[PDB]
Design a protein around this ligand. Structure first.
Ligand SMILES: [K+]
Ligand SMILES: [K+]
Ligand SMILES: [K+]
Ligand SMILES: [K+]
Ligand SMILES: [K+]
Ligand SMILES: [Mg+2]
Ligand SMILES: [Mg+2]
Ligand SMILES: [Mg+2]
Ligand SMILES: [Mg+2]
Ligand SMILES: [Mg+2]
Ligand SMILES: [Mg+2]
Ligand SMILES: [Mg+2]
Ligand SMILES: [Mg+2]
Ligand SMILES: [Mg+2]
Ligand SMILES: [Mg+2]
Ligand SMILES: [Mg+2]
Ligand SMILES: [Mg+2]
Ligand SMILES: [Mg+2]
Ligand SMILES: [Mg+2]
Ligand SMILES: [Mg+2]
Ligand SMILES: [Mg+2]
Ligand SMILES: [Mg+2]
Ligand SMILES: [Mg+2]
Ligand SMILES: [Mg+2]
Ligand SMILES: [Mg+2]
Ligand SMILES: [Mg+2]
Ligand SMILES: [Mg+2]
Ligand SMILES: [Mg+2]
Ligand SMILES: [Mg+2]
Ligand SMILES: [Mg+2]
Ligand SMILES: [Mg+2]
Ligand SMILES: [Mg+2]
Ligand SMILES: [Zn+2]
Lengths: 49, 64, 51, 44, 110, 118, 155
RNA sequence: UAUUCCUCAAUGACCGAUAGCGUACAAGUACCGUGAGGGAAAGGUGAAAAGAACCCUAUGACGGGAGUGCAAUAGAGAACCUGAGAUCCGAUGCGAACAAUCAGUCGAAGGAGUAGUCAAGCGCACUCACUCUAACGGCGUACCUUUUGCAUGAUGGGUCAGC
């Protein structure tokens, strides 16, 4: 099966519309190492390890 | 599984159509698939009722 | 409803008056239309013409 | 599968080489046409 | 017609029909055919609108359009339908006077 | 003229004394231009030599609109007709006339509404 | 004095569509918010967009006397580069054309206006209102600063 | 008298980079074929290289400054004069998730941006002002070819530029 017609820029934009990226709602930055990370990601242990 | 369709033969030349539905309509008249055509999809996890279910025993201490 | 009784009538505008129809159960129907006139419609499922 | 070209250097020189062309009148015409066109490879 | 004139006439067209000469030429020629036809059709539509406005104006006083316009003809009143509809919309008392005059001229049957 | 005030203020006659395409405007300058200058005392007529270029007439109006009409290879009567059409114009933009009756007071007796009583 | 500062990165060896998928996310964001958002977006193009935004902020601060802490991303768009064409061999002796694409990325920054700072402050107060896309880009995430604590006496 | 593998001089209402020789550029090359044989593509920074020291951010300057230059999108490494179109990503204004169809045409509510003219008092009403958009209404089954006759579910064309 082949496409019967060329797809217009309008229909292509409609198709690719919901596939746009969205911003992450919550971002954690460690005050010690400065790493920017999602919740439930390990970067540092505290001092007197 | 969903509609108890018979499927195709396991041998005698059958080519990659062992569990498929076969024909889904007629040709050009009607030129379309009718509503309610039995096709694959989600099965179960739906509300159903069983009628005339017989109560055998009541346990009032445990509410069983 | 079409505001075609107004001298300011415009076909692209909805400017009709509000029509309140009272006593709809007492409308006059002649002939044998009570038993012979049918409303028919199709639900979109084959074989399901309702009347 | 087995393909049409099976290389052999001595068969190439015996069929299309310089002295193979020089041995026949048609081969000498091939060489003359070949030089007249200006090909860098006169014989194979 | 030149390619630049066609692109001028295709301004505001949707899709590739404003942009590509093979597609634009057909749509522009069809637009020009519509324009030629609609110069004729506008006169029919506007006379229909004037007659609707006159009929609405005269039926408020109990006179149908045909009796009204024939009563005006019978009295040698030669106002045309465009001006009569403008009177029915904007000068209703003068239009009512004309309706009374035409009803005395030609009441019609009933 | 808009309410009695003439709108065309300047008529520029741009021409070449060498080029063959300015023959008609040169004959217009010699023959018809003094009569038009006489009949229009409110109009300023300046004449400009532009060698090597095709001739034109330019009309500058009260509303600061300028209209140029090329008159290359024209007969003198066509040049005079173009100058007359420049004089008779109000200097407006050439767009489609939306109506043929401009009024700010469409009704003397009041527009028909549903509240009108007879 | 200058209002708009840009940075351009040419000859990025990626698809323009894939780069624009990430570049469209950071449009209308403050520069620090966008830089934080790119570090949690798992894409190849995230590092490239990060580099161009970083270069643009540096250009604005160093060459044009703009304040780097008040920059918003006005534009981020992609242009094509020099595409490289190869033959793509199929079965049965047929072939198509394969392209190794290239792209350029342009990021334009500008300083936030005081009205826009007032709106940003108004967006950070607590309410249940729906945000438009532009207002969401102004306040894209909640930033949480955490300190590592050893022997926080729990589990 | 015939012819041009050749030489010297000259001419052209001959061509000017898809043209003119197949070749304006290291072409009978690259490439294809066992072989005979077939056979390309690809010209142009600037007057002069003065071809961008140094700084900043990237792993890395082709970026942003600085400087050279008349001009730097005139900033290139077989390619930078001009720099169209299809095509791709953005910015602003208006429309847009209760309404269907060669996508226009004739009317047109509203929205948005923007000028100027001047008698009389320095406003204000005039230029149907102008530009963009278009809710809503009426009308409207592409083009070419071939045919007795094509919206035709007959043919041809993905689009653009050059020929
Ligand atoms: K060639
Ligand atoms: K230049
Ligand atoms: K260019
Ligand atoms: K319409
Ligand atoms: K056929
Ligand atoms: Mg069975
Ligand atoms: Mg079975
Ligand atoms: Mg098989
Ligand atoms: Mg099988
Ligand atoms: Mg059908
Ligand atoms: Mg060989
Ligand atoms: Mg394969
Ligand atoms: Mg392809
Ligand atoms: Mg492809
Ligand atoms: Mg070329
Ligand atoms: Mg050229
Ligand atoms: Mg050539
Ligand atoms: Mg450099
Ligand atoms: Mg030059
Ligand atoms: Mg250039
Ligand atoms: Mg373009
Ligand atoms: Mg937009
Ligand atoms: Mg709605
Ligand atoms: Mg539809
Ligand atoms: Mg219109
Ligand atoms: Mg219709
Ligand atoms: Mg036939
Ligand atoms: Mg027909
Ligand atoms: Mg067809
Ligand atoms: Mg047919
Ligand atoms: Mg086809
Ligand atoms: Mg073409
Ligand atoms: Zn940490």
């Amino acid at each position: 099966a082949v496409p019967k017609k060329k797809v217009s820029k309008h229909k292509r934009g409609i198709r690719n519309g919901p596939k746009a990226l969205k911003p992450v709602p919550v971002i954690i930055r460690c005050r010690s190492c400065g790493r920017v990370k999602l919740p439930h990601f390990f970067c540092c242990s505290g001092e007197r390890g | 599984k969903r509609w108890k369709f018979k499927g195709g033969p396991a041998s005698h030349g059958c080519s990659k159509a062992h569990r498929k539905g076969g024909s889904t309509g007629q040709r050009d008249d009607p030129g379309k698939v009718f509503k309610g055509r039995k096709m694959p999809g989600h099965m179960g996890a739906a509300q159903r009722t069983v009628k005339n279910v017989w109560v055998y025993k009541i346990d009032p201490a445990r509410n069983l | 409803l079409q505001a075609k009784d107004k001298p300011t009538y415009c076909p692209n505008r909805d400017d009709g008056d509000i029509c309140i129809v009272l006593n709809a159960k007492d409308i006059g129907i002649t002939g044998r239309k009570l038993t012979d006139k049918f409303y028919r419609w199709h639900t979109g499922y084959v074989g399901h013409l309702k009347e | 599968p087995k393909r049409t070209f099976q290389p052999s250097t001595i068969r190439r020189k015996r069929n299309h080489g310089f002295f193979a062309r020089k041995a026949t009148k048609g081969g000498r015409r091939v060489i003359a046409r070949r030089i007249a066109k200006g090909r860098h490879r006169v014989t194979a | 017609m030149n390619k630049k004139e066609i692109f001028k006439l295709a301004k505001g067209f949707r899709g590739r029909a404003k942009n590509c000469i093979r597609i634009a030429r057909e749509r522009v020629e069809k637009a020009l055919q519509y324009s030629y036809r609609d110069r004729r059709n506008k006169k029919r539509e506007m006379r229909g609108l004037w007659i609707e406005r006159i009929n609405a104006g005269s039926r408020q006083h109990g006179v149908n359009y045909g009796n009204f316009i024939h009563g005006l003809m019978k009295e040698n009143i030669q106002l045309n339908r465009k001006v009569l509809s403008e009177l029915s919309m904007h000068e209703p008392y003068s239009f009512k006077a004309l309706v009374d005059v035409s009803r005395n001229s030609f009441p019609g049957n009933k | 003229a808009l309410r009695g005030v003439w709108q065309l203020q300047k008529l520029v006659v741009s021409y070449c004394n060498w080029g063959g395409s300015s023959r008609g405007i040169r004959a217009f300058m010699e023959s018809e231009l003094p009569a038009l200058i006489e009949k229009n005392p409110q109009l300023e007529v300046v004449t400009e030599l532009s060698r090597g270029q095709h001739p034109y007439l330019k009309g500058i109006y009260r509303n600061r609109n300028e209209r140029v009409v090329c008159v290359k290879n024209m007969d003198p009567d066509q040049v005079l007709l173009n100058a007359t059409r420049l004089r008779n114009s109000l200097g407006r933009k050439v767009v489609k006339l939306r109506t043929r009756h401009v009024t700010k007071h469409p009704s003397v007796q009041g527009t028909w509404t549903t509240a009108v009583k007879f | 004095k200058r209002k708009k500062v840009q940075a351009v990165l040419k000859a990025i060896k990626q698809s323009p569509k894939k780069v624009n998928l990430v570049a469209a996310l950071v449009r209308g964001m403050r520069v620090e918010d966008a830089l934080m958002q790119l570090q949690v977006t798992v894409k190849r193009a995230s590092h490239t967009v990060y580099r161009v935004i970083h270069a643009a902020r540096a250009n604005a601060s160093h060459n044009h006397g703009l304040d780097p802490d008040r920059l918003i991303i006005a534009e981020a768009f992609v242009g094509k580069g020099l595409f490289k064409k190869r033959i793509s061999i199929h079965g049965k002796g047929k072939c198509g054309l394969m392209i190794r694409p290239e792209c350029r990325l342009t990021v334009i920054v500008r300083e936030t206006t005081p009205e826009e700072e007032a709106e940003i402050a108004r967006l950070k107060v607590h309410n249940f209102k729906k945000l438009t896309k532009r207002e969401r880009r102004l306040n894209p995430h909640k930033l949480i600063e955490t300190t590592p604590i050893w022997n926080r006496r729990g589990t």
